[PDB]
């Protein structure tokens, strides 16, 4: 949580959505909360990710 | 359960992976695929928490996170006239997971990009000589590149001794060093 983590440009002309790093951190899933787990869009998106073998972690 | 109220991102983004080769006969095109696309903060977190962290990745693999209409290839029209700010981590002592995450947050958060967007995507490369972070820009406009590079330096928490190099895609010496 160094200063850059609160930085974000203000009064953007050509963009609508900007977030500082700490604002994005604040939206991360929290300890012991099922809001993400129970969200059916989130659940389906995670299920659409590749199986573990895809990443070829075994190659080191 | 119920849907969370999502927080939109300014553009959609796609995560790509380059796999390491397992056979002498695999080409680059065989080794790269787009994995998943997203346009909310919450979808981003769910992806990041369910794919391997950087410290898990094998040698000669890459994560690429690019705007959904740009391929992570310099041939792409959006990249071909541009380049990348590059940083190499000589050493495994840095927390590559947090450096990568901070970079991603800065990118999807639109914090270090110019208002008139220059950033097309960002690439994590796992390499024997040392791992690399690359921030891909659409142009070589010097003044916008300097502001992006300085902010990238702050995101990565480098001291003056640590150096970012900008490489125009049309090659291999750097044209700017910070
Ligand atoms: Ca971790």
UniProtKB/Swiss-Prot annotation, chain A:
Subcellular location: Cytoplasm
Top-level taxon of the source organism: Eukaryota
Functional note: Can regulate translation through binding to eIF4E. Competes with eIF4G and p20 for binding to eIF4E in vivo and inhibits cap-dependent translation in vitro. Plays a role in cell growth and is implicated in the TOR signaling cascade. Functions independently of eIF4E to maintain genetic stability and to attenuate GCN4 translation upon TOR inactivation.
Assembly: Interacts with SMY2, SYH1 and eIF4E.
Miscellaneous comment as given in the Swiss-Prot or TrEMBL entry: Present with 3240 molecules/cell in log phase SD medium.
Protein name: Protein EAP1
Species of the source: Saccharomyces cerevisiae (strain ATCC 204508 / S288c)
UniProtKB/Swiss-Prot annotation, chain B:
Gene Ontology CC terms, in alphabetical order: cytoplasm; cytoplasmic stress granule; eukaryotic translation initiation factor 4F complex; nucleus; ribosome
Crosslink (Glycyl lysine isopeptide (Lys-Gly) (interchain with G-Cter in ubiquitin)) position: 84
Keyword field: Cytoplasm, Initiation factor, Isopeptide bond, Nucleus, Phosphoprotein, Protein biosynthesis, RNA-binding, Translation regulation, Ubl conjugation
Subcellular location(s) per record: Cytoplasm; Nucleus
GO biological process: nuclear-transcribed mRNA catabolic process, nonsense-mediated decay; positive regulation of formation of translation preinitiation complex; regulation of cell cycle; regulation of translational initiation; translational initiation
GO molecular function, a single term: mRNA cap binding
Function of the molecule: Recognizes and binds the 7-methylguanosine (m7G)-containing mRNA cap during an early step in the initiation of protein synthesis and facilitates ribosome binding by inducing the unwinding of the mRNAs secondary structures.
Miscellaneous field: Present with 14200 molecules/cell in log phase SD medium.
Family the entry assigns: Belongs to the eukaryotic initiation factor 4E family.
Assembly and oligomerization: Component of the eIF4F complex, which composition varies with external and internal environmental conditions. It is composed of at least eIF4A (TIF1/TIF2), eIF4E (TIF45) and eIF4G (TIF4631 or TIF4632). Interacts with PAT1 in a RNA-dependent manner. eIF4E is also known to interact with other partners.
Protein name: Eukaryotic translation initiation factor 4E
Lineage: Eukaryota, Fungi, Dikarya, Ascomycota, Saccharomycotina
